[PDB]
Every structure is written in structure tokens, then in C-alpha cells.
Amino acid sequence: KSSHTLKTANSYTDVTVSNSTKKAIRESNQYTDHKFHQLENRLDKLEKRLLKLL
Amino acid sequence: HTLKTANSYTDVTVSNSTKKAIRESNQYTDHKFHQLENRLDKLEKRLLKLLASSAALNS
Amino acid sequence: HTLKTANSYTDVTVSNSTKKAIRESNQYTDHKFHQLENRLDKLEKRLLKLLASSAALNSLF
Hints:
The structure is a homotrimer. By secondary structure, chain A is mainly alpha-helical. The first copy, chain A, has one domain (1-54): Up-down Bundle (Single alpha-helices involved in coiled-coils or other helix-helix interfaces), CATH 1.20.5.2280. Helix content of chain A is 94%, strand content 0%. The first copy, chain A, has one helix at 3-53. Chain C: It comes from Yersinia enterocolitica.
């Protein structure tokens, strides 16, 4: 009607989009933890084999 | 009717972006996980050689 | 119209967002990767050292 309309819509875009950026980042970071845990545990196992051998 | 049309464009386009964001990021993670695993596979071979070397020493 | 200014606004802000999320998440991965690269380098080094000493000890006897 339309200034107050554009304005309201823009504000909706703003909150929504911002909550999406944060969500993507949490979700990807989680994944990254899940994958990198497997590498850390493998590494933990290897130094422990080494120490035992020594 | 317009406001409803903007907002529902926002919801749809936002939902697709979050998905593309995660999908790309994860793909990059996977590439980095593989590069590390290449390293770990090597290290484990050297431990396996060192191990056989150590039981040669005994004597 | 008003559906055109609000929709182009939404596309531009969605665009910047997508790029920001991927960038930030990849920084996260990069940092964790470095940390682990660090832990690997050290272990590699000790192993190389221990192979050198053991091999030399073997040839000597």
C-alpha cells in the first residue's frame, strides 16, 4: 500500500535470513565435529600404540 | 495479498539457501577429512614398519 | 511494484547469506584441520626420528 508494506516485508527477510545464516553455520559445524572426531580418535589410537611400543 | 507474497518468497528462498550453505560446507569438510585421512594412513604404515623394526632389534 | 523491491531485496540478502554461511563454516573447518595437522606433524617427526635410530641400531648389530 505500500511503503509500510515493503518496510514490513524487508524486516521479515531480515530476521529470517539472519536466523538461517546462524542455523547453516551450527549445522555445518556440527558435521565438522562429527567427522573430525573420527580423525582425532584414530590419532589418539596411534599415539597410544606408539607409547605402548616404546 | 502482496505482503503475503513477499514473506512466502522469503520462506522458500531462505529454506533453499540454508540447504545450499550446509551442502557446500559439508562438501568442503569432506575434502579436508580426506586430506587428513591420507596423512593418517601414512603415519599408520610408519608405525607398522617401526613395530617390525623393534622386534628385529631383539636380538 | 512493491512486490519487486521486496523480492529483489530478499534475493540480494539471501545471496549474501549463503556466501557468509559457507565462509564462516569453512573457517571453522580450517581451524580444526590446522589443529589436527599440528598433532600429525609432531607424530610424523617423532616416528621419523625413531625409525632413524632403530634402523641405525639394527645395521650396527
